[PDB]
Amino acid sequence: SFRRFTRESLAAIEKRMAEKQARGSTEEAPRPQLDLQASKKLPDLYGNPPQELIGEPLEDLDPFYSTQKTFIVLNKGKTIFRFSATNALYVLSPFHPIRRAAVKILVHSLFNMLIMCTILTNCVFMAQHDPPPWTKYVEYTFTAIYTFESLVKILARGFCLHAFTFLRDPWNWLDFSVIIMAYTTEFVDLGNVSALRTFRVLRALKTISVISGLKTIVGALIQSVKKLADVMVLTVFCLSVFALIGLQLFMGNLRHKCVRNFTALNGTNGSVEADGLVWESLDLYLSDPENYLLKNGTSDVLLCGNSSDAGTCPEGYRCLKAGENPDHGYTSFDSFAWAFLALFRLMTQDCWERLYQQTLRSAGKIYMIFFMLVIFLGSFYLVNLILAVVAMAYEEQNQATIAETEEKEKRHKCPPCWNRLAQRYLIWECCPLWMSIKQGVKLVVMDPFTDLTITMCIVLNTLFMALEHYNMTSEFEEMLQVGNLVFTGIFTAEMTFKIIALDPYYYFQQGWNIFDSIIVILSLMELGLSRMSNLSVLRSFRLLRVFKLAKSWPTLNTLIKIIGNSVGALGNLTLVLAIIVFIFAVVGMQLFGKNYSELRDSDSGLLPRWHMMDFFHAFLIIFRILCGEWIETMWDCMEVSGQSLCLLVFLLVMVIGNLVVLNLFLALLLSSFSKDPEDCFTEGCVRRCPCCAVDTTQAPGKVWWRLRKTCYHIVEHSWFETFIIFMILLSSGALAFEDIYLEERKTIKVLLEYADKMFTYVFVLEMLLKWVAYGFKKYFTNAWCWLDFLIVDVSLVSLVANTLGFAEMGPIKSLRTLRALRPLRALSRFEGMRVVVNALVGAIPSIMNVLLVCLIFWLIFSIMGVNLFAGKFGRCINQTEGDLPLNYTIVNNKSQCESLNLTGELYWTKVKVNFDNVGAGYLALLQVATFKGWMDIMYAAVDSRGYEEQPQWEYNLYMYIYFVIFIIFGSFFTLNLFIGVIIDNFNQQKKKLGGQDIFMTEEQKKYYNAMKKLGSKKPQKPIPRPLNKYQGFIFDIVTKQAFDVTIMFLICLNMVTMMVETDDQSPEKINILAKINLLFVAIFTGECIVKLAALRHYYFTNSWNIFDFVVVILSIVGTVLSDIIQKYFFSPTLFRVIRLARIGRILRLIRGAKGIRTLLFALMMSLPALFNIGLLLFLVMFIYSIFGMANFAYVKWEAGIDDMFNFQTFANSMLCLFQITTSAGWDGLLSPILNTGPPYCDPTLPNSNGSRGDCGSPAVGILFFTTYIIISFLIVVNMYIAIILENFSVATEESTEPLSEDDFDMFYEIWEKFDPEATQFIEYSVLSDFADALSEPLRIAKPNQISLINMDLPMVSGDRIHCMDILFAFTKRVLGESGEMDALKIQMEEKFMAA
Ligand SMILES: CC(C)CCC[C@@H](C)[C@H]1CC[C@H]2[C@@H]3CC=C4C[C@@H](OC(=O)CCC(=O)O)CC[C@]4(C)[C@H]3CC[C@]12C
Ligand SMILES: CC(C)CCC[C@@H](C)[C@H]1CC[C@H]2[C@@H]3CC=C4C[C@@H](OC(=O)CCC(=O)O)CC[C@]4(C)[C@H]3CC[C@]12C
Ligand SMILES: CC(C)CCC[C@@H](C)[C@H]1CC[C@H]2[C@@H]3CC=C4C[C@@H](OC(=O)CCC(=O)O)CC[C@]4(C)[C@H]3CC[C@]12C
Ligand SMILES: CC(C)CCC[C@@H](C)[C@H]1CC[C@H]2[C@@H]3CC=C4C[C@@H](OC(=O)CCC(=O)O)CC[C@]4(C)[C@H]3CC[C@]12C
Ligand SMILES: CC(C)CCC[C@@H](C)[C@H]1CC[C@H]2[C@@H]3CC=C4C[C@@H](OC(=O)CCC(=O)O)CC[C@]4(C)[C@H]3CC[C@]12C
Ligand SMILES: CC(C)CCC[C@@H](C)[C@H]1CC[C@H]2[C@@H]3CC=C4C[C@@H](OC(=O)CCC(=O)O)CC[C@]4(C)[C@H]3CC[C@]12C
Ligand SMILES: *[C@@H]1O[C@H](CO)[C@@H](O[C@@H]2O[C@H](CO)[C@@H](O)[C@H](O)[C@H]2NC(C)=O)[C@H](O)[C@H]1NC(C)=O
Ligand SMILES: *[C@@H]1O[C@H](CO)[C@@H](O)[C@H](O)[C@H]1NC(C)=O
Ligand SMILES: *[C@@H]1O[C@H](CO)[C@@H](O)[C@H](O)[C@H]1NC(C)=O
Ligand SMILES: *[C@@H]1O[C@H](CO)[C@@H](O)[C@H](O)[C@H]1NC(C)=O
């Protein structure tokens, strides 16, 4: 262009721009105008940097759409900066140094750094809660910078004058407000209301000024909620309907509790007597807290139930409805808002076992079914809908992003330059003197022989460090030191030899030699610091050598790639998430700081845990709520700082954090992706005995053939199969009567043992019959038969032990409990579970491959924890007071309080789950990674002190970092890898079989395909006209939208009528509610009667006309007739369900929805795939429950085991199994069955059965719980995958070819033109000149018409061309094979053919 601007340069366009409206003007395509936006390099025209053209305005070489008067300035980085040049009043001019200077500062990047040097410093000064008095001065300094920035920007573009001003960018005006207060509070009397100074922590958003990557990623994040639509509508609808159901059932059922026994007035007025003390009235008697009872082992209140299956409390107590609600009164069902909150808590899967147990105890066990109905509809499907929608949105965005560049692309490194001469002294390190040593070292260091050897020396070391535990003697330390020294020596020898073998110049090639160098030097320098002092965690980083297997293991490379992609390639989302967490923590602390000082009030300095008085605790609470535990802290709030603030803040942070984490997870996963039967057997050992092919003419030859034919005929009958299935079902079901009450029932044991004998009899006979039927092919080549063989063998050895009378040997009794595998025979009879078990068994190797690396990555942390927390958990306690540690002032170590054990009331004890060895470490890590029971482990860890020393309250605070790091690493990337592997394997299996799904059989295939068909339209008018007047003035209103609008208004009014319900009120509410309900029922009945003669009997179609009838009118008249009895009202439990059917009137609005219909269609699509999974899960639950019934029958009642939740009978065991199947709390069940001490168990107990003791053995319980958890996780993953696959597969419309009626118009016109008979003929010699001008372009060109001479055309008469066959071929081109519209045309031609 030019070196500098001239005054007359812009005149040529200024004299013409203003006349565009009249002279300039007298196909628009609004486009980005060939890219060329700000903050980009964009080398496209020249591609060569200028010499000294930096920091000057340019002539705006750009399309006129974005030129006007603006100009572009570039920096040394060629950053495009646009500035519109217009008059700014005063004496200012676009060509004046006061603007040249501002532009030159704005374009330059230096002051950019300045900004980044300021705000981060602010982020430190803002994190203090007790600032020093002198920091005020520093505050001014900060302001004295920020305003500067704003000033320069104004000087470049203007304030708000013409265009492209400082206030046109959305990100700009945010800083404006930051300036306001920066000059306001200094010179104004502050308002009466304080705590407004928390606005300052919004300038952290200014961090989005670091780079454009933050801006584009924020735009990407915000460009997903618009796609995410109507899914929240469906979620709100489901939550509302479930809350409405829940209100009608458990209303006022959370106040039940039992009080001590009453006594009559005993004369006088208003005087209730009890144990010699008199109370004034009933209100003041039922409200005193002393008159209640506490559940044993906990500081809570017991609840009663009047039903036969709701529990009770001991004698001397009667249960009534009085008092306040449990948990400070924030959980209840009295009103709609609390019910909504409880249902939302149930959706999130927060601590819901508490509410589960409370509701079950108060109302009854039979109500558990209700919970079974919510989880399946609230815990999985809505979450999966959200997941699938966001995944589709992200995939579409990435597809568009890559397609943009795909379309677009089609259409020095030596700063010092002084070390090169040093290379003249390098490389040639062999020196002029010759040596044969180098050749020898090069030869001996050869990969396929020595390298494997070194690998061995790495594995054993990993085991050698694994030998760390409690209570060793000096020998173990000696061996550990010797082994460590030997391994370090061998490593240093390898290094020294390798560097001599391969020249130092080539040594640093891939960086793994660098890794070896740093690990060797670190190990040596750690070995050097081994004296009396300087002892620390000497593992340091020598555990890193475990990763050196990366060469030999092609699986850990994927984990390394994922970890690497977590930084750099996708390194901006982590920054955004960190910024969000930081700002949320700071705002929470600022808001809720000075409201926790009143919560101690005891023990002279006992501060409750999880507070917000400091930055660290706020960060911990933010991390915890991100993990998925928020209700407990919300309860701690809302009683010290208000109720309408914590709710909003917590909901906002939860939503934002979950969205960000989920998007990061998806992005990382996608990046990581980037007739004789066979006689005996084959021709094997037959060379020794060809004794089968013998004379078949005599009896010895014919008998075997006849018998085998007979057996083949016998096994083929269906009656035999049904008999066997019935026997299997009965045998499986007969094991439910083995509870603790079997001894009392004298007349059931004999029947049970007779059945036990008969089952084995029939099974052995059946097995032998099949054994003689087929041959030796089965039981040895078929997979299914081996299981039956093994079970029959177990039963056979059991029966031979029983019959011989030697069943009192001992370990023989162990096989008796192994009968719980009997129900497993039903895994091959129904088609059913066969497909799902096949799919599950076809994926084992991938699971093993992932499991190996998982165990290694947890073993490293187990070793670290074993070192760091060895023997720091013991404490001695006073038995009478309970299980609380005393103090450090009196008792300090074990010796002191073992010397104080004079009267026999001090007991030393250690936590159930600890870190005393590697196995306990594995158990603790499994407990932590599932977020169940981690609180006790964390509390013990923080409470730690010296070796076997008594704990000190919060002595080692900074040990939360280890657990935070573990949760970040081991619970996120391993999950990503597992999900990716499973998805890859499942998709590969899907591609292998073909275009057919896996979890479906033939019958379900037929149903799926048949009901998939869509498209059925029939808007006929079968409306008679007895008199056009009377019906003609109403049917017009019927057709208009006014009718349906009034209908939805009536539905909404009914919804708001059912809105208002609470506990007992005055009758004036009840009467009004009943009157409104009656009016709405009346209007609905009238509405349904308006049908009358409007549609006659022609309305019985697929439309929603039977649904509303049968759901609304029959149910409402039934309920109202049940209510008008007016004689008596017994069994209110049998009364609420009657009016529960009124909720069916709220489900009619779906008919007029938009996407809810499609999502319900997805439900209907998916159900068959979930049926089989449910069947398999139920079978697994049954077998595990019957197995567990026989081991934990007489365990002590403590912690998570109560009288209503135990293993003493079938129903309670099933309830516990349902509770645990979602990993909803199993520490409380594992703890009681783990203890084995005389302080907590009595080995001598008068058990009703021939057994001793009161507690079991953990060695079986640990396996019992672990295997069940693993199996449940694996099955739930399969359900998840099937649901999402179906949901994102049904998102398609395509075309079903429904338009075929308007096809014969052209043919009718042609016939009317030439011959109206539909049987005419044509000739190509005339066609080539006749078929030239045709409208409705459904025809072909003239050359293409000639090719139709021998294209599906019979030859009749003198080589004439049949028109009807041409019509059939033409209609067959699109869909002429089956239909309802073209079928009439084909039938018309066929009928014309007849005559
Ligand atoms: C830039 C964003 C993404 C992260 C910002 C977080 C850190 C840069 C901040 C948060 C808390 C800050 C700490 C808060 C408190 C202290 C103690 C302070 O000195 C004291 O010990 C003061 C004692 C007292 O509190 O009275 C020195 C700074 C330091 C370490 C701060 C250093 C900077 C920290 C780690
Ligand atoms: C205390 C008060 C004054 C705070 C007010 C803040 C909002 C007015 C700001 C803060 C963040 C801004 C958003 C940050 C990022 C973007 C992306 C940006 O995307 C684009 O430029 C793409 C084109 C388009 O979205 O139309 C559009 C503006 C928007 C939504 C901004 C709109 C204005 C927002 C909401
Ligand atoms: C980063 C920011 C934007 C997060 C959101 C903060 C505000 C929405 C919060 C911070 C302080 C809050 C206020 C703190 C104290 C009170 C007093 C409280 O009751 C009174 O004492 C009312 C007295 C009156 O109205 O005169 C009513 C809510 C209110 C105004 C709060 C309203 C909500 C506020 C402004
Ligand atoms: C905290 C300490 C004790 C352990 C972790 C230290 C890491 C921050 C450093 C140490 C060694 C570094 C590695 C040393 C050498 C290289 C080779 C280097 O290779 C290249 O530059 C070329 C890559 C290619 O071949 O394509 C890539 C980075 C990498 C793996 C480095 C990645 C970062 C590492 C692991
Ligand atoms: C490693 C990540 C996960 C920490 C996340 C929070 C950090 C940004 C902040 C929160 C509180 C900060 C601590 C607050 C006070 C101290 C005390 C003081 O250190 C000590 O007295 C020695 C103990 C140590 O440095 O670990 C200075 C650093 C430290 C640990 C700070 C280090 C940085 C911490 C952990
Ligand atoms: C890198 C991988 C392989 C493991 C990561 C583990 C870290 C999260 C651990 C290892 C060493 C730990 C540190 C080891 C020692 C200390 C000193 C400790 O200080 C006290 O106990 C002070 C109390 C007092 O003596 O008065 C506080 C925890 C801290 C910083 C630990 C914080 C957590 C660390 C960094
Ligand atoms: C352990 O608990 C017992 C029971 O509370 C404490 O004994 C109390 O004090 C003396 C003995 O110290 C007894 O005579 C009293 O009967 C007990 N109760 C009360 C209310 O005083 C005992 O002191 C506790 N501590 C130790 C170390 O034994
Ligand atoms: C109940 O007794 C009180 C106190 O003696 C008395 O004032 C009151 O009138 C009595 N109420 C009756 C008798 O209804
Ligand atoms: C503690 O309460 C439980 C609850 O069932 C009861 O069984 C037990 O007997 C109580 N303990 C004592 C010592 O009475
Ligand atoms: C306590 O009251 C209940 C109420 O049903 C009664 O059954 C029981 O006998 C009473 N017990 C005593 C000791 O008064």
UniProtKB/Swiss-Prot annotation:
Phenotypic consequence of L303R: In BRGDA1; uncertain significance
Extracellular compartment residues: 128-135, 188-194, 251-335, 357-364, 469-477, 528-537, 592-615, 635-643, 739-749, 805-810, 869-913, 936-958, 1061-1071, 1126-1132, 1193-1210, 1228-1258
Any one GO molecular function term: voltage-gated sodium channel activity involved in bundle of His cell action potential
Region of interest (Disordered), residue spans: 17-34
Protein's membrane topology: Multi-pass membrane protein
Effect seen on changing F1109I: In LQT3; uncertain significance
Tissue: Found in jejunal circular smooth muscle cells (at protein level). Expressed in human atrial and ventricular cardiac muscle but not in adult skeletal muscle, brain, myometrium, liver, or spleen. Isoform 4 is expressed in brain.
Effect in UniProt of substituting R345C: In BRGDA1 and LQT3; express no current
Name of the protein: Sodium channel protein type 5 subunit alpha
Origin species: Homo sapiens
Lineage: Eukaryota, Metazoa, Chordata, Craniata, Vertebrata
This protein's encoding gene: SCN5A
